[PDB]
Amino acid sequence: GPMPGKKFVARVAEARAEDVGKRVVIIPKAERAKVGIKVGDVVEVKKV
Amino acid sequence: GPMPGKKFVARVAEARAEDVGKRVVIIPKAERAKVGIKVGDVVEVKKV
């Protein structure tokens, strides 16, 4: 596979029934408060 | 709110029915190939 540290850009969404089976990162409320995330916000996801 | 650029660490999961209504980042197959993500992998999410 690729070396670690690569990233992509995405938007935080509200999960719906049609998303069952998709690959997701779940962002709990406490983490949203810490990093300042609202649904609709652009985030960058990096593989560690 | 906070300044942008803060992050938290999480693991990529398969979304289930119990996740409906949660805040998520959906990672499509093409992006998983580009960054080398598998379900179970640790990622870092940053607010832009």
Author numbering:
A (entry chain A), B (entry chain A): 1 to 48
Article sentences:
Here, we study fold transition between distinct β-barrels by protein engineering and structural biology technique. Here, we discover that the previously reconstructed ancient DPBB sequence could also adopt a β-barrel fold named Double-Zeta β-barrel (DZBB), as a metamorphic protein. The DZBB fold is not found in any modern protein, although its structure shares similarities with RIFT and OB. Furthermore, the reconstructed OB fold could also be converted to the four-stranded SH3 fold by a simple circular permutation. Thus, these ancient β-barrel folds (DPBB, RIFT, OB, and SH3) could be readily interconverted by a few feasible mutations through the missing-link fold, DZBB, indicating their significantly close evolutionary relationships.
Phs018 has remarkable sequence similarity to design-1 (26–35% identity), and we replaced five residues in design-1 with the ones at the corresponding positions of Phs018. AlphaFold2 (AF2)19 predicted that the resultant mutant, design-2 (Ph1), would fold into a RIFT-like structure, albeit with a low lDDT region in the 1st β-turn. Circular dichroism (CD) and size exclusion chromatography (SEC) experiments indicated that design-2 was folded (not random coil) and had moderate stability (Tm = 58 °C). Design-2 also formed crystals under similar buffer conditions to the third type of design-1 crystal, including lithium sulfate. By molecular replacement with the predicted design-2 model (RIFT fold) and subsequent manual remodeling, the crystal structures of design-1 (third type of crystal) and design-2 were determined. Surprisingly, they both adopted into a unique β-barrel fold that topologically differs from DPBB and RIFT. The five point-mutations derived from Phs018 (RIFT) in design-2 stabilized the DZBB fold. Furthermore, the addition of five-point mutations in design-2 stabilized the DZBB fold and abolished the capability to adopt the DPBB fold. Most DNA molecules did not migrate from the well when mixed with the proteins with the stable DZBB fold (design-2, -18, and -19) and RIFT fold (design-3 and -4), indicating that these proteins formed large aggregates with dsDNA. Design-2 seems to have a higher affinity for dsDNA than design-3, as dsDNA shifted even at lower concentrations of design-2.
